[PDB]
Write a protein that binds this ligand. Structure first.
Ligand SMILES: COc1ccc(Cc2nn3c([C@@H](CCCc4ccccc4)[C@@H](C)O)nc(C)c3c(=O)[nH]2)cc1OC
Ligand SMILES: COc1ccc(Cc2nn3c([C@@H](CCCc4ccccc4)[C@@H](C)O)nc(C)c3c(=O)[nH]2)cc1OC
Ligand SMILES: [Mg+2]
Ligand SMILES: [Mg+2]
Ligand SMILES: [Zn+2]
Ligand SMILES: [Zn+2]
Lengths: 338, 325
């Protein structure tokens, strides 16, 4: 009630007022208090001129932002602060990379909105868990795959179909259909299996050179950009990436505990008795995150620093891995842990 | 107090002497000496023996491992060998008595540091003994002489000149034998004697057997259950790392096993068990088929270190759910 009232009547605060470094790749959006994030979303939308350009109703946009935020639960990693930080990176790509020379205005808008919605109602477990636990979400979507991603998309649509929240409701039939198709494609691209399926096509696109007149290049670029936002925690400083690791493994390990309770053997990365965090993170950096940011660098020369930071963080896991071995005694001078 | 009134399992190799309250240890020493009939057979004066025993206990300091409870545990194992191995078939009674007394006195006034550290820090003990080697072991012996020559503590004061001299010489050889350098020097000789067969009428065999038994008592914590060998490892490494910290402050570089930043406990303990402890209990087993269970416990304890080694690598998160370490 009161949150909506202040967003609506206080006016959209200037983006520069959030932090002097807010538009830099070195800014860490997790630094912003959660209570200030809904206004920051409106400030970013305004700074990208989407509110004016698409003549978005302000009461409707306020209601939509609050409803999207309210649509996240609170597991350790897949919560609203993740969606907010993913959306922020999308803003950073816009401000720093000149996306308008590559993408249509409506595609950029859809990317940002998709970022806000892309993990809606996440329950802290992955696609395989849905299927193994015979969840309602799997009853609905398992035959199509990307179970959680389909749910996230369905949740975004349900918000738009809530009276008072359809920020697109004045769009023409064609523009409305375009927006919803984009949101579908972008949200589904956050599944790893999807990314692995298109990786060679992404390589081929970077090799031949981006063609702005090629519809398929637009679609491929949107997928790559979405994935670069989803993984953007890795482009920050060491301290950020370390904290994020903690949150991700806490969540992964909770899942593994539930799998064990159902009589299943969890994947090693979900198994708190077998997971060795440094190797797992080095592998993620080397085999998944680094190639994504190397691709981004191939397409946007100004994205070079991003790849350099992810590479630097990968190096830091190597340097710190020796500390995971217990030399001497533990701090309590006891071998009670056996 | 008869030994059977202390615990029904007191004379068993399964008994853990460190279970006995420290306040009761002096009485258990008397009970053990009574059970071996040493007091009656050499006509020891009982108040003199009581005063001696309390002086010995008091002459130990309180580092984590080399304290009175170590000396008590070592001397209890000596008693266990007497009871379970029937030592009187192999050794003279006086050599048995000497061994037990040596076990009580063998680490007197230990400072929780090794010989190298005494020499490196230029302590008075190093000034006195470094030229002859075995610095701490010479001090332990000189402390024991000092006690015997304290008024009312000379348990050997009625002995014949011959027996008195024999006791002095045995205590010296046995305490000096507690040095690891000495043990490795005579190890081939120990193997030789075990190969050809122990000779009850060869005086050199008696000397060698006495050395081997002493080291077998000094390491006896490893012949107990896993819980005991785990606790004792904690004590040993707390003591070692404390010396290593001191060496680092003096500008020196500790051996790896005393460097808390470098030491990997499972590898060190496995190495100790495999290359030092097991060969000793194997020898003991070659000479006494009854000591077979001791070797077996040691080898089993060795295997347990390698089954728990993986726990020294942090998998998953720490308990606090944080990577703040
Ligand atoms: C070797 O394979 C992995 C190793 C480690 C992880 C854990 C992990 N997951 N992770 C994630 C995602 C998985 C992202 C998968 C992905 C999907 C599409 C495109 C690229 C990657 C978790 C939270 O679900 N985001 C980040 C920044 C990380 C991260 O730093 N680590 C996940 C792994 O595979 C999914
Ligand atoms: C690879 O070499 C070692 C590895 C580990 C140790 C530490 C250690 N020492 N230790 C000791 C003694 C050293 C015993 C040395 C010895 C002397 C005579 C005959 C055999 C061994 C420490 C406390 O000084 N007793 C025991 C039961 C242990 C023990 O379990 N571990 C010592 C080591 O060499 C001395
Ligand atoms: Mg997701
Ligand atoms: Mg000693
Ligand atoms: Zn996500
Ligand atoms: Zn000792």
């Amino acid at each position: 009630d009161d949150e909506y009232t202040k967003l609506l009547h206080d006016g959209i605060q200037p983006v520069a007022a959030i932090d002097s470094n807010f538009a830099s790749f070195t800014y860490t959006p997790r630094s912003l208090p959660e209570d200030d994030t809904s206004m920051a979303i409106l400030s970013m939308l305004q700074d990208m001129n989407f509110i004016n350009n698409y003549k978005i109703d302000c009461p409707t946009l306020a209601r939509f932002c609050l409803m999207v935020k309210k649509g996240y639960r609170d597991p350790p990693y897949h919560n609203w602060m993740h969606a907010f930080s993913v959306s922020h990176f999308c803003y950073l790509l816009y401000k720093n990379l000149e996306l308008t020379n590559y993408l249509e205005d409506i595609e950029i808008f859809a990317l940002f909105i998709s970022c806000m919605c892309h993990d809606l109602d996440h329950r802290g477990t992955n696609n395989s868990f849905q299927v193994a636990s015979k969840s309602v979400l799997a009853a609905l979507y398992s035959s199509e795959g990307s179970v959680m991603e389909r749910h996230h998309f369905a949740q975004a649509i349900a918000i738009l179909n809530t009276h008072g929240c359809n920020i697109f409701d004045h769009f023409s039939r064609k523009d409305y259909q375009r927006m919803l198709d984009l949101m579908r494609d972008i949200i589904l691209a956050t599944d790893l299996a999807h990314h692995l399926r298109i990786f060679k096509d992404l390589q081929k696109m970077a090799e031949v050179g981006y063609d702005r007149n090629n519809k398929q290049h637009h679609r491929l670029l949107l997928c790559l950009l979405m994935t670069s936002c989803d993984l953007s925690d890795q482009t920050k400083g060491w301290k950020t990436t370390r904290k994020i690791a903690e949150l991700i493994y806490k969540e992964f390990f909770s899942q593994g505990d539930l799998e064990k309770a159902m009589g299943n053997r969890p994947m090693e990365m979900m198994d708190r008795e077998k997971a060795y965090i440094p190797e797992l993170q080095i592998s993620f950096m080397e085999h998944i995150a680094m190639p994504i940011y190397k691709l981004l660098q191939d397409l946007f020369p100004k994205a070079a620093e991003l790849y350099e930071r992810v590479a630097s963080n990968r190096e830091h896991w190597t340097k710190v891995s020796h500390k995971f071995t217990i030399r001497g005694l533990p701090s309590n001078n006891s071998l009670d842990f056996l």
